Design brief:
heterodimer; A: 1541 residues; mainly alpha; two-stranded antiparallel sheet; 76 helices; B: 63 residues; elongated; Nucleoporin NIC96 (chain B); protein transport (chain A); nucleus (chain A)
């Protein structure tokens, strides 16, 4: 929007500043326009108007109407009370509080948080200052960024100078400075916090605790922002002596140690650096006065640290006598004074306080267990923090480290003699009284140095570039003979000074000899301690050993030369020493450090290193100084005690299982591991890991340690499982022993027997494992909500879900190609193994189907926002719903539907899913947008849940907002789905508001996939009759099809797909084919839904929606216009030639067919193996193998594409077909169910005819699948039939269509159904259209068109007659009658002669026999049409000769043929008598003999009919009898039987 | 109301439409054949001897 309030404006400004900070300058003008609107806001940092009594009285007198600026509002008894409460809580003016509450009400934040209005007002008031200060902080930070353009760096600087500091720019120009305003603001914030704490303690000594905590967080953040702004202002040299004295006085009056001091220490540090150090107002006259003034305090350590810093920064002046004047001033006196002052400051605990502050600054919730107890062995007497949740930022830590390293450099380059004398005094004290422990000043200082130089290689390199500088000098001097604490501190410093590889290599080269410390003395001391332990130990020795181990591990992890040298050094033997030391009696810390050192050494390794490591491990575990089987388990149980050593050993094992090539054959361990002794190889290790993870997880009290151990175990299991070849074993078991030789079989057998995958699965089939897993996944929601995305709990849950997924995937492979082989091997050979699996649990689902809270926890974990965790939970739920045993146990009433209806879990899950799918996505990060991935995962889950077992309800129906009842569904009153607020309605909304028509690219791909998945889900819900009625009701009540049509887009060969054109050859190979198929399926589903709804509305006899549907279809909306249905018929185009494909030459591999490749799906591997075998045979033939090889290769690179192309093409084809079918169906529903007049719609009929004309002309005889769909609709619409032009056009189109039908009939194309459709189309044309110069011309032209084909078509018509099909034969029989009639209408006829030449009359008359057996029913109508055709021929004079030569008199006798059944019998008799009479009377006196013979042989029967003639069924029977009598009388009078007498 | 009231499905709707079209075509063909036959008989009998053809038989055969 644009009319944003204060909160929204500040939020937008903060977002723009953060974007610009992340190297995104797409909002420069936006920032320039925003900074001008909030100038009054940036002028004053924070200021709350004092509570006025006038406004209070005015609000309390007439709380009816309020006027704020230009707006007016109405006040009520509740809003006035809220205003008064807010003003009393925050002591804010009534007007400002009223404005804040009006803004809160307008924004409508009461429902988003569900809290009192006054609490929301307070939250908004805090957010105001929060953002107002964060904007200034980010502005000042960007103004000093060196990695950006100088222009913007100066623009932001001048903007901050003009707005924040209120100092006008150089091109222009009572007021108060910025430092006093900031100081007053900080004082007010402190007083407000104090008053809030006091009032809270008074009232508590509720539902507002979280609000108070958030307010305190906002206040401390605002204080930190103000401190950073003040530090920046001081660094800009905008301070004076008055502010310095005021700050010093405020410090002297400090009461309690808290985060405020840690936030203000940079302020005074910068003050001293500007005034104290010669890096600013270097006035020696003022410097001496400041020194005399600084040199009351409520905390002596603060004064000591301040004096030490001032002395360290002031020594820069007393260096030379050329840059400044030092005349008439003594040096030795001042030197001794500063020395004694610094010694006093040290004795008071300056460095101790500095170290405590540095430690409390980086206080992390969790720390790596590889550095436990490090830098935490001192005697700290400074009170600790209250442990309240006040986490620090990153800029503050950076500034603190910068200041610390600067102070270190100053102290090292200015006071070397001080450190020398301090070290000598400490040494003398420790010598003259070893029983006592001297001060830790030097150790604390070295630890502070280490903390300063951490993660900053740019500054760490300074200690190695110039080896003859002050830094390198002190580094080399601090390595001489000293005590254990100093050596430990130096080792820790070296460790922390190895953030990269270059620093690690530099430290390695500096420590070794090219006296100072050397590796020789280190290893000598190590061997001495080893021999002493093996033939007590003091804490100092243990600390020294731990420090040495940590340093070695860090060097090996960072450097490479040291890792490659020390690992195989013959003079050191580090591995031997650490192994001899570990086997001794020592705490677990040393063992953990040794394990971490080994891990570091083995983080990158090769075959020889792995072999040596395994050799040493076996040698030291087989006889550690009692049989080996006992010693190994003793050592395992010893290393299992605790968590540090156990976790370190687990990590070492996990690292050792990684192959040297990195993350397929050559399992990462020697195949001969444990061959000497009778051991299973590596199985004992996995067995111990699993039993520890299963049983020894109860002795861990620290939740963090338990989480870390579980994460390590899950990582180990995943590393063991991912190192198993699945496809390899499948191909082996398939073709190795059955096709290939038995040579490589031994390799696969050994791989399957030695790989721990089988044992891992066997353990996974245990109840302890799944119980531990479901307990770890089962945690309270508050922990996950308050935890960090990188928290160990989330990572452990993710690893557990991944392990479960991998197990569910590989359980089949295990039970099939692992279990039987292992069993056979154990039965044949001699192996002693202990089963750890449950025989009852036939599958992995048997052990977990008894846990119902798992799905509940998985669903509740969806409202956390973690993309990976959400996707994992969705995949797990999908796989669970896809199984069969779980749903068989749940629904054998049910257990799942009741589990999710305990405390409204389903409702909140549906709400979270709706809020997620409603969340927008990033157009740039389409395929990477976590939101889109979560949406696709949810859609796939719903699809899989609805597709499996659709008849019976499932969890999907409940999540959609339906009342899942036993074999029944329903909706509840006032429920979420009833109020149109549910997952289904959310999907509908996000679908109708989705636009795919773009300009930069056009027809995007991922939106198409989203809508395709949504439509698939909708179709699955519709087809299910259990969830069809309510769905249709809810859809038709919201005008879904209307919104869909409004969102439709026309397709044309010009609009490209994702910037790619369709005609391009790469289209078939690119991914646009998927989007095209998806769009086709979407159109098909939309057309199907429209047709179904139209049919339903039409069959319900209600014009309420009928006329609306027809208006939307015609292109008008009551007016908004839209393309009609005929416009969407643009996907039928043969120009692309999807069927035709250019076949390359393929000079070689031509004989390689796609037999074994082939639901048209040609597998590529079936041909890949064939071509590989052929290439191998060709190479073995040794005939120009190297040269032509390339040829073959590229040939493959062709055929692969070819294959895929076909597949793609095939898909497209069927897709089109589907769509077409749907369209056809829709069109049918549009023709029959249409009560509207016919003359107005005639235009649409002509348009459809014109559109289908080219389609039929292009697919007249190509394919017989779409022809049926396009011909049945034509047949239908042909029977449902200014005016002169319309009639002429109709006649022309019908005459044109009549040609292709006869063409296809003569060519014998398609199946009998398509031929019957063509026959009907031609029959309704030759019977109604033709039946007056125009009529004669049309008849002659049709006869000419028929003669053009001639007997070629009559032959097929006769062939398809009296055949297998029942309808095609009758259609052909009727078409023959129509043809002969139309031909006679034009004394002879060529059609009868052609039929006689084809021997059709002969077989037709021969089939007359057994007519009684054949005679509503299809056979009845077929025989009726046959007799009608036969009678039609007996009317012509020429046909008489052929009908007589056919000898039908002897055929009608063998049949023995001579109220409704009687009517049909009389009708058949009438037909036969008519045929006989016509045949007799056609020729003349040549057939009278046959007539007389027939009348004499059948005398008497005709007499009954002639005497009979002399309610509806009765009249029909009488009419049939009359017709029979008339036919017999005609036969008699034509034969002349009277003359015979 | 809606969602089904003595209604049918699209799969059966199209089948019923096709069956009705086929039955109507067969009925129209039968009616046209009958009408053509009746017209032919009327044209062939209207020449002469309309009532004599039956009177000769009524006189010869038993009335």
């Amino acid at each position: 929007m644009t009319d944003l309030r204060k909160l929204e404006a500040l939020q937008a400004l903060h977002a723009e500043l953060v974007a610009v900070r992340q190297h995104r300058f797409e909002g420069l003008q936006v920032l320039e326009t925003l900074l001008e609107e909030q100038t009054d806001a940036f002028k004053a940092l924070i200021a709350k108007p004092a509570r006025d009594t006038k406004d209070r009285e005015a609000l309390g007198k007439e709380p009816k109407k309020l006027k704020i600026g230009e707006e007016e509002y109405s006040l009520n008894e509740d809003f006035v009370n809220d205003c008064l409460k807010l003003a009393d809580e925050l002591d804010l003016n009534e007007k400002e509080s009223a404005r804040i509450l009006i803004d809160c009400d307008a924004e409508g934040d009461v429902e988003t948080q569900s809290r009192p209005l006054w609490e929301c007002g307070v939250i908004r008031f805090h957010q105001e200052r929060k953002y107002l200060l964060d904007c200034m902080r980010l502005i000042l930070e960007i103004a000093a960024d060196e990695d950006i353009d100088a222009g913007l760096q100066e623009s932001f600087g001048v903007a901050a100078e003009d707005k924040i500091f209120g100092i006008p720019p150089p091109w222009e120009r009572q007021v108060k400075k910025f430092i006093p305003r900031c100081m007053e603001a900080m004082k007010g914030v402190r007083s407000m916090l104090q008053c809030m704490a006091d009032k809270a303690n008074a009232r508590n000594m509720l539902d507002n605790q979280e609000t108070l905590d958030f307010s305190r967080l906002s206040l401390v953040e605002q204080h930190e922002c103000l401190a950073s702004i003040l530090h920046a202002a001081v660094q800009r040299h905008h301070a004076t002596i008055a502010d310095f004295q005021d700050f010093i006085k405020i410090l002297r009056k400090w009461d309690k140690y808290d985060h405020f001091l840690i936030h203000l220490i940079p302020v005074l540090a910068a003050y001293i650096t500007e005034f104290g150090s010669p890096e600013g107002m270097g006035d020696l006259q003022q410097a001496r006065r400041l020194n005399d003034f600084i040199c009351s305090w409520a905390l002596p350590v603060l004064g000591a640290a301040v004096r030490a810093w001032w002395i360290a920064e002031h020594n820069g002046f007393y260096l030379d006598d050329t840059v400044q004047d030092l005349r008439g001033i003594n040096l030795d006196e001042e030197d001794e004074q500063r020395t004694k002052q610094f010694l006093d400051a040290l004795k008071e605990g300056a460095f101790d306080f500095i170290l405590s502050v540095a430690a409390d600054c980086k206080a992390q919730e969790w720390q790596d267990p590889s550095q436990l107890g490090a830098r935490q062995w001192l005697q700290r007497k400074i009170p600790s923090l209250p442990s309240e949740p006040f986490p620090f930022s990153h800029f503050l830590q950076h500034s603190l480290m910068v200041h610390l390293e600067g102070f270190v450099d100053a102290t090292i380059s200015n006071l070397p003699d001080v450190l020398r004398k301090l070290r000598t005094e400490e040494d003398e004290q420790r010598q003259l009284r070893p029983n006592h422990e001297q001060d830790m000043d030097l150790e604390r200082f070295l630890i502070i140095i280490s903390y300063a130089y951490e993660g900053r290689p740019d500054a760490a390199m300074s200690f190695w570039e110039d080896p003859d500088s002050n830094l390198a000098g002190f580094l080399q001097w601090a390595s001489r003979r000293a005590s254990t604490p100093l050596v430990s501190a130096f080792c820790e410093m070296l460790r922390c000074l190895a953030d990269n590889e270059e620093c690690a290599t530099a430290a390695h080269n500096f420590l070794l000899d090219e006296q100072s410390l050397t590796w020789s003395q280190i290893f000598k001391e190590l061997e001495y301690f080893t021999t002493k332990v093996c033939s007590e130990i003091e804490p100092e020795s243990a600390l020294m050993l731990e420090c040495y181990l940590r340093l070695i591990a860090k060097l090996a992890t960072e450097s490479e030369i040291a890792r490659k040298r020390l690992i195989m050094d013959e003079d050191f033997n580090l591995v031997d020493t650490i192994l001899k030391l570990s086997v001794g009696v020592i705490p677990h810390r040393l063992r953990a450090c040794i394990f971490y050192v080994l891990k570091a050494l083995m983080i990158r390794k090769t075959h020889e290193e792995l072999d040596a490591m395994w050799r040493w491990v076996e040698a030291w575990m087989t006889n550690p100084f009692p049989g080996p089987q006992e010693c190994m388990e003793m050592m395992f149980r010893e290393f299992g005690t605790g968590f540090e050593q156990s976790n370190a050993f687990i990590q070492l094992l996990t690292t050792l299982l990684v192959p040297p090539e990195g993350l397929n054959d050559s399992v990462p361990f020697p195949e001969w591991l444990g061959s000497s002794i009778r051991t299973l190889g590596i199985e004992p290790y996995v067995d111990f890991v699993f039993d520890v993870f299963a049983n020894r997880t109860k002795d861990i009290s620290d939740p963090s340690q338990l989480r870390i151990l579980r994460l390590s175990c899950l990582d180990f299991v995943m590393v063991c499982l991912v190192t198993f070849n699945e496809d390899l074993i499948v191909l082996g078991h398939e073709s190795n022993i059955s096709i290939d030789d038995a040579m490589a079989a031994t390799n696969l057998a050994t791989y399957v027997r030695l790989h721990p995958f089988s044992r891992v699965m066997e353990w996974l089939f245990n109840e302890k494992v799944i119980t531990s897993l479901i307990n770890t996944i089962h945690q309270d929601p508050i922990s996950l909500g308050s935890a960090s995305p990188d928290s160990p709990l989330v990572v452990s849950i993710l690893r557990a879900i991944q392990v479960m997924i991998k197990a569910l995937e590989l359980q089949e492979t295990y039970l099939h190609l692992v279990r039987p082989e292992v069993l056979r091997y154990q039965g044949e050979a001699g192996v002693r193994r202990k089963p750890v699996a449950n025989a009852a649990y036939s599958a992995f689902e048997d052990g977990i189907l008894s846990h119902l809270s798992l799905v509940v926890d998985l669903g509740k974990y969806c409202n956390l926002g973690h993309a990976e965790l959400t996707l994992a939970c969705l995949k797990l739920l999908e796989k669970i719903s896809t199984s069969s045993r779980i749903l068989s146990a749940w629904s054998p009433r049910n257990k799942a539907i009741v589990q999710l209806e305990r405390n409204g879990e389903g409702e909140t899950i549906s709400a979270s899913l709706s809020a997620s799918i409603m969340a927008t996505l990033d157009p740039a990060l389409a395929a990477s947008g976590e939101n889109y991935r979560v949406k696709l995962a949810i859609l796939d889950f719903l699809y899989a849940c609805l597709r499996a077992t659709p008849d019976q309800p499932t969890i999907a129906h409940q999540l959609l907002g339906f009342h899942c009842e036993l074999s029944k569904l329903g909706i509840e009153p006032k429920g979420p789905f009833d109020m149109q607020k549910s997952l289904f309605h959310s999907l509908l909304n996000v679908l109708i508001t989705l636009t795919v028509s773009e300009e930069e690219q056009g027809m995007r791909g991922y939106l198409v996939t989203l809508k395709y998945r949504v439509l698939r889900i909708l179709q699955l819900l519709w087809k299910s009759p259990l969830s069809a009625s309510l769905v249709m009701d809810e859809l038709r009540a919201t005008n879904f099809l209307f919104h869909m049509l409004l969102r439709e887009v026309q397709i044309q060969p010009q609009l490209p797909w994702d910037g790619q054109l369709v005609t391009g050859c790469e289209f078939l190979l690119s991914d646009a084919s998927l989007a095209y198929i998806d769009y086709l399926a979407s159109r098909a589903a939309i057309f199907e839904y429209i047709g179904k709804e139209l049919c339903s509305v039409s069959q319900n006899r209600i014009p309420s929606i009928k006329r609306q549907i027809f208006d939307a279809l015609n292109g008008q909306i009551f007016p908004l216009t839209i393309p009609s249905i005929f416009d969407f018929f643009d996907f039928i185009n043969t120009d692309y030639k999807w069927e035709e494909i250019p076949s390359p030459h393929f000079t070689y591999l031509k004989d390689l067919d796609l037999g074994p490749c082939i639901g048209v799906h040609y597998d590529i591997r079936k041909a890949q193996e064939i071509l590989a075998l052929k290439r191998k045979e060709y190479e073995h033939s040794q005939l120009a193998t190297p040269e032509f090889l390339e040829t073959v290769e590229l040939e493959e690179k062709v055929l692969i594409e070819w294959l895929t192309v076909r597949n793609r093409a095939n898909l497209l084809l069927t897709a089109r077909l589907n769509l077409l079918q749907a369209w056809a169906n829709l069109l049918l529903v549009m023709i029959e169910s249409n009560d509207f007049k016919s003359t107005p719609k005639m235009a649409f009929l002509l348009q459809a005819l014109q559109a289908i004309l080219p389609t039929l002309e292009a697919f007249s005889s190509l394919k017989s699948d779409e022809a049926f769909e396009l011909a049945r609709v034509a047949k239908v619409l042909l029977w449902k039939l200014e005016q002169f032009t319309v009639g002429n056009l109709i006649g022309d189109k019908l005459f044109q269509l009549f040609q292709l039908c006869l063409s296809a009939i003569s060519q014998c194309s398609g199946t009998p159904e398509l031929r019957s459709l063509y026959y009907s189309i031609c029959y309704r044309y030759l019977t109604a259209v033709v039946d007056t110069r125009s009529v004669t011309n049309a008849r002659a032209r049709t006869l000419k068109a028929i003669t053009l084909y001639g007997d070629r078509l009559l032959n097929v018509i006769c062939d398809d007659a009296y055949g297998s099909d029942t309808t095609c034969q009758t259609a052909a029989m009727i078409l023959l009658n129509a043809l002969v009639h139309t031909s006679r209408a034009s004394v002879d006829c060529p059609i009868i002669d052609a039929l006689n030449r084809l021997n059709f009359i002969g077989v037709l008359v021969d089939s007359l026999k057994e007519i009684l057996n054949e005679w509503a029913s299809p056979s009845q109508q077929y025989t009726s049409a046959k007799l009608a055709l036969l009678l039609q021929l007996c009317q012509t004079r020429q046909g008489a000769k052929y009908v007589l030569q056919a000898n039908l008199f002897r055929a009608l006798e063998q049949s023995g043929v001579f109220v409704v059944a009687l009517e049909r019998h009389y009708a058949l008799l009438v037909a036969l008598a008519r045929v006989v009479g016509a045949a007799v009377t056609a020729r003349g006196a040549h057939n009278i003999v046959q007539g007389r013979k027939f009348l004499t042989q059948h005398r008497g029967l005709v007499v009954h009919v002639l005497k009979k003639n002399a309610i509806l069924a009765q009249q029909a029977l009488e009419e049939r009898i009359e017709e029979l009598a008339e036919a017999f009388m005609l036969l008699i009078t034509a034969t002349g039987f009277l003359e015979y007498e | 109301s809606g969602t089904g009231l003595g209604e049918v499905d699209v799969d059966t709707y199209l089948s019923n439409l096709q069956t009705k079209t086929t039955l109507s075509m067969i009925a129209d063909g039968l009616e046209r054949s009958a009408r053509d036959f009746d017209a032919f008989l009327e044209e062939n009998v209207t020449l002469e001897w309309e009532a004599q053809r039956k009177r000769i038989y009524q006189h010869f055969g038993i009335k």
